Structure 1
Amino acid sequence: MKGILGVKVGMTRIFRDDRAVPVTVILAGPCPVVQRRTPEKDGYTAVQLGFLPQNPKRVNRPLKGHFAKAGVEPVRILREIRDFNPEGDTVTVEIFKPGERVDVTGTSKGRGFAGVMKRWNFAGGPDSHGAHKIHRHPGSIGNRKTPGRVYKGKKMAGHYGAERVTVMNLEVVDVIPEENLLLVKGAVPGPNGGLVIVRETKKA
């Protein structure tokens, strides 16, 4: 169960076999392993990964100590890939071959305080025929005296996006090791420049 940290760079399409392929480009490698989690020491199995070079002027003394125990230069982002144990002391895009199938986790674009029609795809009210100031309103949110309350989880307006989203079973279309690039077919969560995580897919 391999994995790698990365950043979404943007989308294009390429041509493969007289076919246009929508792709998202991800700058994935190189990721230095800075800690290994072991069942004897940590109770589970995972590999703590680092990503992006960091100005050591910004890294506080608690963090500096951590990086030294791994003999690894300062890094901007730490994230763990679970049930992964690479042979090397560094992870690159090489662990994926074109044709493979992956899961990508990212942070969805935030739509802030979102109405019920955008958030929950409600149908709202009429725009004529007497509709009175309720065009984007939810309608009823309950019954009467029984039960005399509102369900937990009741779909209502509120914040939406800026949340963890994982898209699955995405085809690796190409991998360009010289530039730490990963070409994945389709749409990946988050804005360009946003951080992603690329793991081997759990689908069949």
Structure 2
Amino acid sequence: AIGLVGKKCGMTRVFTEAGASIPVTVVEISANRITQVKNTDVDGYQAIQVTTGTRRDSRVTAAQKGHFAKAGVAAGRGVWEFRANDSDLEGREIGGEILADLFEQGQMVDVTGNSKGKGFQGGVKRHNFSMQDATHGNSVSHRAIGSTGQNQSPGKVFKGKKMPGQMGNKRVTVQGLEVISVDVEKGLLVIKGAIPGATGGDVIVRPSVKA
């Protein structure tokens, strides 16, 4: 149930010999150093804590510097934790190594990332609200919300009403994506799909939960 953290490198295509174009995305997979192994006895639950990337020393706090030093690993750009089980905590020891070898070609994986942020967005784009008449006497409410409720009964707006607000820039998971190719010497992970976020953003890849 454990995965790895990567960085979105952009999209491309993979051509099959039969003459099909596969829309793929490239995920750079640096070393995932294991910074802590949490178990049911010390933490109440089993998980693996990993780090990847690098940070300069001036940008690493003393508390983090000691957290990494106990593991014996270099400070990464972030710290991510994967919920595991007894079978997953087999060869995973403190300061260990997690490469792209975790995945094999043809395996369905779950990729999570932060979506591109659109900022404040109206109901038309945020919630697929129908636009109102561009002509036919329509006043200054072309992309307006329309009605937001009923009359005196209930005399309020219900909670969860679809309205303008912040769009994107949220955690989003795409399921059922195939691993097109794995290359570990160069830290490659080619995956079929779209992978929420922009180029350069951190993405987490885990084995698919649907199965």
TM range (shorter): over 0.9
State the distance in 2 between where 1:198 and 1:132 align: 49
2:130 paired with 1:157? no
What's 1:14 paired with?
Answer: 14
Query: Which of 130, 153, 158 is equivalent to 2:137?
Result: 130
- Whether contact under 8 Å (2:34, 2:48) holds in the other structure is yes
What's 2:41 paired with?
Answer: 40
What's 2:199 paired with?
Answer: 192
State the distance in 2 between where 1:62 and 1:183 align: 36
What's 1:100 paired with?
Answer: 107
SS at 1:179's partner residue? Answer: coil
Kindly provide the amino acid, as one letter, of the partner of residue 38 in structure 2. Answer: R
What's 1:58 paired with?
Answer: 59
Deviation, structure 1 residue 86? 5.6
Query: Which of 116, 129, 139 is equivalent to 2:123?
Result: 116
What's 1:31 paired with?
Answer: 32
Identity of paired residues, percent?
44
Which deviates more, 28-37 or 98-107? Answer: 28-37
State the distance in 1 between where 2:48 and 2:157 align: 44
Q: Deviations over 1:156-201 (max 9, x none)?
A: 0011111000000100001111211100001000010000000000
2:94 paired with 1:87? no
Cα RMSD between the aligned structures? 1.0
Query: Which of 196, 200, 209 is equivalent to 1:202?
Result: 209
SS at 1:198's partner residue? Answer: strand
Deviation, structure 1 residue 91? 0.2
Q: TM-score, normalised by structure 2?
A: 0.94
State the distance in 2 between where 1:140 and 1:20 align: 46
- Give the ranges of 4+ consecutive aligned residues of structure 1 lying more than 6 Å apart after TM superposition: none
- Whether contact under 8 Å (1:23, 1:184) holds in the other structure is yes
What's 1:147 paired with?
Answer: 154
Q: Deviations over 1:61-115 (max 9, x none)?
A: 1111101110111111100011143614110000100100000000001010011
State the distance in 2 between where 1:124 and 1:168 align: 31
Q: TM-score, normalised by structure 1?
A: 0.97
- Whether contact under 8 Å (2:11, 2:25) holds in the other structure is yes
What's 1:70 paired with?
Answer: 71
Deviation, structure 1 residue 2? 2.6
Stretches of structure 1 that go unaligned for 5 or more consecutive residues are: none
Which deviates more, 176-185 or 77-86? Answer: 77-86
State the distance in 2 between where 1:86 and 1:132 align: 67
Shift in alpha-carbon separation, 1:86–1:51, aligned structure 2, 3 A: farther
State the distance in 1 between where 2:190 and 2:89 align: 24
